[PDB]
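INPUT
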Amino acid sequence: AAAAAAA
Amino acid sequence: PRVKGGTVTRKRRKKVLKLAKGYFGSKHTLYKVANQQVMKSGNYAFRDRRQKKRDFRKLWITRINAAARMNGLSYSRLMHGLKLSGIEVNRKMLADLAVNDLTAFNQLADAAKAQLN
Amino acid sequence: AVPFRRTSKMKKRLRRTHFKLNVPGMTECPSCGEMKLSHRVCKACGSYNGKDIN
Amino acid sequence: NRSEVRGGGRKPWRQKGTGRARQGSIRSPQWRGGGVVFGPTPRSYSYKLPKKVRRLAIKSVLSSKVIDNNIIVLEDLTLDTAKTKEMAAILKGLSVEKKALIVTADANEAVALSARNIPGVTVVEANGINVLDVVNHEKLLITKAAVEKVEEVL
Amino acid sequence: TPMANASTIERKWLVVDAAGKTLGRLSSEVAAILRGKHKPTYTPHVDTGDHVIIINAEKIELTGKKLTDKIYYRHTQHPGGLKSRTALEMRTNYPEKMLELAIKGMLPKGSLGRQMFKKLNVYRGSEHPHEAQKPEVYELRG
Amino acid sequence: QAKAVARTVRIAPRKARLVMDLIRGKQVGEAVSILNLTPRAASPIIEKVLKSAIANAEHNYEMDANNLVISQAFVDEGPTLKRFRPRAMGRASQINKRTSHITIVVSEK
Amino acid sequence: YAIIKTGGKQIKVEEGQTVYIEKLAAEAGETVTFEDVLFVGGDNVKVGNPTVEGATVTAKVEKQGRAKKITVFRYKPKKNVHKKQGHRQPYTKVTIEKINA
RNA sequence: GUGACCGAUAGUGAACCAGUACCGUGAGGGAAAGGUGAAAAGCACCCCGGAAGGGGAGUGAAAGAGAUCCUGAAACCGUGUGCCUACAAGUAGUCAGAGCCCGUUAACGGGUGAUGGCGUGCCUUUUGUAGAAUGAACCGGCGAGUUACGAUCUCGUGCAA
RNA sequence: UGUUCUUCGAACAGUGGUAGGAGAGCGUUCUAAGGGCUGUGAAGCCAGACCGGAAGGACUGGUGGAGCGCUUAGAAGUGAG
RNA sequence: CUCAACGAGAGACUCGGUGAAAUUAUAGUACCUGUGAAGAUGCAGGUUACCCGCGACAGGACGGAAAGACCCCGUGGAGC
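OUTPUT
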């Protein structure tokens, strides 16, 4: 996936 | 019993830091870079104690080549003449001091001239 | 926007070369002194060329 | 030990998410709360040599004191009063200046109450002899009854 | 223990004529002169070499088809900054920095290399303004 | 030579050095008037230390204060008071209330 | 000046000059001689068919001593290999006089 | 009453107004923090300063001993001074090396060093790391092959079918 | 360091090294033995151009103001990047 | 937007007062082409570059922040 959704 | 061990560690650190005196910046101040610099200096000291023995020799070869080319011969012909004109084992930095004491080098050069023909 | 390496002492001192501030334009007050900065009323005597105007 | 320190079992912070170490216990051995995994533990240092070695040890140390001429034999140890001045005069009369043993077969009370204030002198019974008092004092004063006891005891 | 000169070096002035030699074979000899390889008092860290003057730089020649094939590049720090000229255009207009680029290529790289580059003097022929130094004529070894 | 030390007054040392680097080495008659006009509000504290040093020269040694000159003008650091400032999302950043030792030594020229 | 090999390395010496050579024993305080002298010098005599007769150079031994200590530390820059060793090279200091031809 | 038990990051969490301060609605979690001097004899008095804080003068064996107060290291911050630095691309060292400045546990002396040659930190994990793979801002302290009971082997001692 | 001869010892050969195996040592705390330094100055701290093959150890000068070291052994809360 | 141009206020800029944080092996920390754990500020060859700042931009430092969430393994777990 490699989704950049860092919180 | 309990062992604290407070002083021997600081003695080691100060021995390393006094061995690393004169270094740039934090390398004469902080222990953990001073120890690495001292170890690297030990490797460099061993390597350069090996390398000095041959770069001095190449400097003396250069100076003997210049002094021989003043007299009309190259370095290789001069050394071949020295091995042919008797077995003379005259070492090369004494041959380099022989041009500080000219014209003693010219007489050995003429001795090389004599039996190359 | 994050410092990769820390600044050494020498680079910090080189950057702080121009951080110093200058001496003000201070001159002798003709009434009393000492001393009085140029183009301002003297705080001691309250005079300016040359009346006591406070 | 790590279990016996007065400390909670919770973890101070969660396992992931913070940029810190894991640190599952409040007082792990790397913490300031202590600290020891092994440590000293209460134990007995007692062990027994075989009996022939014990008899050989006591006989050999007695023979080594005999060949060094440090043995003094005093028959019956006659002491009139309970004063330690008389015992000090007796030790002075036999040229004893360093530490000494006094071996008494019947364990006389006048001998026992005396010479215990002198720091280098230890009064011991005939069967109460041992390796350390013989090697420690380097001179023994032994009665004839004590010799005639320890010859058949050991 | 061996001798190592420092602030006692005597430097002479030499005149090298480039009428018939190559770019080329003389440039290595001039670089060896500037390094000090001809003197027995050579010390590699103090620049024992001496001054040299080159005259008739326009009379230099180079063999083969290098007059149209040899290309000099002077790339800037800008994109698309590659500027090029042939050896004929570099000889015809000003061959002085042709000769100095040859010497700079054959000199060592460093502070001493930039120092020994300063002793080189290349002029369009056949006069030089260094007659006050009284230079001597040097003949090439070959 | 007379010496006056401030010893833990509330001023950051880096801000005091910005005045002390230029006040150093000057005559004391040309030193108070520099401090009056800079303004750089550590300079009243440096003025108090300077007048204390001049008075110590006049009263304890009688050094004829019109001939004095500043000799040593070093700034040291005192103990730091630790304060915490609340930030966004519960960060609790640290605030250092810096403290300096101001020392002025005057002597003859 | 004369050309002396006694190391086994070749050295160039003057009259009355103190030199440092390798640790030959010499029973220090006793006169030591060098017999393998090349190129006797002075009149600039060539050397050939070496160790010629009549080339005798004598010396006076003053000290049997130690050089400055060298800490020979070598480590491979990985692999946990460390090696520390001090070195103390012995020498012989002689004073050379009466060069003979 | 005794420790081949600890000595203030140790030893009880707690040598000190400690289950205290503080955190949590609550159950609960839970600190940091010892040392003047033998005796306060704890700086009378003078000067600067609003005060704090200093400089003299006294007490004291010591005041650099003056209220977190015995000794006081390092990271860090400064002030002076000897030698080098504004044409130089450097894991910052090492070998060679002139000049300048000093004299030591007098010893082929110490400090700084223009310039040349060589030279891509330490650890971990890897076939292979200068690695643009991991860890460390720095300094100081603490921090991981122990102990109980059995078994086996080597060595030593005692007695020996 | 290993082998031979063994006439103080000599000759010859060997001595890069990870995982690992074997051997010899240096330091820290406490205890037993004697012996010995200490306010005419201990431990600790700071500096030095000293010594040893290494871990390390001494000697001077300053600070410090009361304990420490040596020996042959023995135990370990036994050495930090 | 074609296609952007002015004007007002707050921050940013200067001065006075006070004053952090993420990060950080040391660092005197250029470019091109190659080489190399195969994408170099530090390696090799060459090309450039006096020393120290201030205001801006963000191409790189495989930037920082979270022991990748995807994929696989664990004879790990949990919910259905």
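end of record. Residues 70 and 102 of chain D are 13 Å apart (CA to CA).
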